[PDB]
Design an enzyme around this catalytic site. Structure first.
Site, PDB file in Angstrom:
ATOM      1  N   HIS A 120       5.100  -1.057  -2.912  1.00 33.35           N
ATOM      2  CA  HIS A 120       6.094  -1.475  -1.913  1.00 33.35           C
ATOM      3  C   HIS A 120       6.737  -2.771  -2.353  1.00 33.35           C
ATOM      4  CE1 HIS A 120       3.762   1.339   0.680  1.00 33.35           C
ATOM      5  NE2 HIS A 120       5.014   1.750   0.891  1.00 33.35           N
ATOM      6  N   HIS A 173      10.996  -0.283  -5.411  1.00 31.10           N
ATOM      7  CA  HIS A 173      11.027   0.720  -4.357  1.00 31.10           C
ATOM      8  C   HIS A 173      12.238   0.508  -3.455  1.00 31.10           C
ATOM      9  CE1 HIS A 173       9.675   3.389  -1.176  1.00 31.10           C
ATOM     10  NE2 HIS A 173       9.595   2.391  -0.290  1.00 31.10           N
ATOM     11  N   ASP A 178      11.107  -2.422   3.471  1.00 31.49           N
ATOM     12  CA  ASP A 178       9.712  -2.785   3.196  1.00 31.49           C
ATOM     13  C   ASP A 178       9.555  -4.269   2.905  1.00 31.49           C
ATOM     14  OD1 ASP A 178       8.005  -0.479   3.638  1.00 31.49           O
ATOM     15  OD2 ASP A 178       8.698   0.385   1.728  1.00 31.49           O
ATOM     16  N   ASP A 193      12.971   7.184   1.777  1.00 34.58           N
ATOM     17  CA  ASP A 193      11.700   6.516   1.519  1.00 34.58           C
ATOM     18  C   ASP A 193      10.795   7.343   0.628  1.00 34.58           C
ATOM     19  OD1 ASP A 193       9.917   4.334   1.909  1.00 34.58           O
ATOM     20  OD2 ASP A 193       9.147   5.102   3.822  1.00 34.58           O
ATOM     21  N   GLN A 205      -1.792  15.337  -3.150  1.00 32.56           N
ATOM     22  CA  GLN A 205      -0.332  15.473  -3.308  1.00 32.56           C
ATOM     23  C   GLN A 205       0.146  16.834  -2.808  1.00 32.56           C
ATOM     24  OE1 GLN A 205       2.182  12.994  -4.483  1.00 32.56           O
ATOM     25  NE2 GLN A 205       0.455  12.104  -3.408  1.00 32.56           N
TER      26      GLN A 205
HETATM   27  C1  LIG Z   1       5.920   9.240  -1.394  1.00 33.45           C
HETATM   28  C2  LIG Z   1       4.472   9.269  -1.011  1.00 33.45           C
HETATM   29  C3  LIG Z   1       3.892   8.491  -0.028  1.00 33.45           C
HETATM   30  N1  LIG Z   1       4.652   7.583   0.735  1.00 33.45           N
HETATM   31  N2  LIG Z   1       2.582   8.582   0.255  1.00 33.45           N
HETATM   32  C4  LIG Z   1       1.825   9.437  -0.454  1.00 33.45           C
HETATM   33  C5  LIG Z   1       0.396   9.497  -0.125  1.00 33.45           C
HETATM   34  C6  LIG Z   1      -0.642   9.548  -1.208  1.00 33.45           C
HETATM   35  C7  LIG Z   1      -0.370  10.766  -0.371  1.00 33.45           C
HETATM   36  N3  LIG Z   1       2.303  10.229  -1.419  1.00 33.45           N
HETATM   37  C8  LIG Z   1       3.606  10.118  -1.660  1.00 33.45           C
HETATM   38 CL1  LIG Z   1       4.176  11.141  -2.899  1.00 33.45          CL
HETATM   39 MG   LIG Z   2       7.366   1.112   4.829  1.00 30.44          MG
HETATM   40 ZN   LIG Z   3       9.208   2.384   1.865  1.00 31.47          ZN
END
Ligand SMILES: Cc1c(N)nc(C2CC2)nc1Cl
Ligand SMILES: [Mg+2]
Ligand SMILES: [Zn+2]
EC number: 3.1.4.17
Length: 325
Positions: free
Chosen positions: A79, A83, A118, A228, A280
């Site tokens: 962050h 980003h 952010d 985002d 994922q």
């Molecule tokens: C973009 C994004 C995100 N904000 N949060 C995650 C968590 C690990 C699952 N994966 C992705 Cl890919």
């Molecule tokens: Mg945020």
């Molecule tokens: Zn963000």
């Protein structure tokens, strides 16, 4: 208080010009800013000037604003300033491809909201702040970090020579701050699930009406989620490199929790990295695919985002099947 850029920083940005070869690239949804780090502030000025015009903001104020925003992003794995510019570029591509659906006030507010969404992130989730009773969670009971990012955006605007919105009428100034506040709060993923469900119902029943402010607010909120999460819409090697940064930040949160005597959830445990591909696949099925599917239904020009997201979901499946690592 907010850190302030130096005179050398904003003056240098005022002199930047984008190489014409990058014009064709920056317009594409899959564009990855990765290889152009020194150009990131300049790329943002270029996108604001294209979407809103060279006279939308006083140049000196805009350059001070951008360089002070950069200074208030921290050295955290994900962050961070990279980003912020990545999310702003995805918003630029969405606005460019759906230009007439958004007012001048909305385009300027949304590009700025994306750059600031952010601000001052410390590398800790809302879950951590709330579970451990951090003072930010006392001030902001829900969407904790998002309320903080908006407060920090207002604080930068209040710095001498940084109020890029001062030339708006008093009514447009209030309106743009409300557009920015709602857009930044929409980046709290907890709010996304309900927002997407409401939009899908409005779209399916034919009640979705972009002339209705509440419906516009929801569409903008979904656009903020789409921007985002846009690392899931880049070419696979880029998506994979950004995922390493996402997890590096979550693992540092998990390490901090372990020191404090609390076992982290598996996603935040660096000793459980082998669970990342299944994590994922879960994130794409539960969050990303539905987000880009609903967005493409409402805004057909955003279809490349959905195509790329589906392509990356297939890549994570290949990783699980041992075809890719
Ligand atoms: C973009 C994004 C995100 N904000 N949060 C995650 C968590 C690990 C699952 N994966 C992705 Cl890919
Ligand atoms: Mg945020
Ligand atoms: Zn963000």
């Amino acid at each position: 208080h907010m850190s302030i850029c130096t005179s050398e920083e904003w003056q240098g940005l005022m002199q930047f010009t984008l190489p014409v070869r990058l014009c064709k690239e920056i317009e594409l949804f899959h564009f990855d800013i990765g290889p152009f780090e020194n150009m990131w502030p300049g790329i943002f000025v270029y996108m604001v000037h294209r979407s809103c015009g060279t006279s939308c903001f006083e140049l000196e104020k805009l350059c001070r604003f951008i360089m002070s925003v950069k200074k208030n992003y921290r050295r955290v794995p994900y962050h961070n300033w990279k980003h912020a510019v990545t999310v702003a570029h995805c918003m630029y591509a969405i606005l460019q491809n759906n230009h007439t659906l958004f007012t001048d006030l909305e385009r300027k507010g949304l590009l700025i909201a994306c750059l600031c969404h952010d601000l001052d992130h410390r590398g800790f989730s809302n879950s951590y702040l709330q579970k451990f009773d951090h003072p930010l969670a006392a001030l902001y009971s829900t969407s904790t970090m998002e309320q903080h990012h908006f407060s920090q955006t207002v604080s930068i605007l209040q710095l001498e020579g940084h109020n890029i919105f001062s030339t708006l009428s008093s009514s447009e100034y209030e309106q743009v701050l409300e557009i920015i506040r709602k857009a930044i709060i929409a980046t709290d993923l907890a709010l996304y699930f309900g927002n997407r469900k409401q939009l899908e119902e409005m779209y399916q029943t034919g009640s979705l009406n972009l002339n209705n402010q509440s419906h516009r607010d929801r569409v903008i909120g979904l656009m903020m989620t789409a921007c985002d999460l846009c690392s899931v819409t880049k070419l696979w090697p880029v998506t994979k490199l950004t995922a390493n940064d996402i997890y590096a930040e979550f693992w540092a949160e998990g390490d901090e929790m372990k020191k404090l005597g609390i076992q982290p959830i598996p996603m935040m445990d660096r000793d459980k990295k082998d669970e990342v591909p299944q994590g994922q696949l879960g994130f794409y099925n539960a969050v990303a695919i539905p987000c880009y599917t609903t967005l493409t239904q409402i805004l057909p020009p955003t279809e490349p985002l959905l195509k790329a997201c589906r392509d990356n979901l297939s890549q994570w499946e290949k990783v699980i099947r041992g075809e890719e690592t």
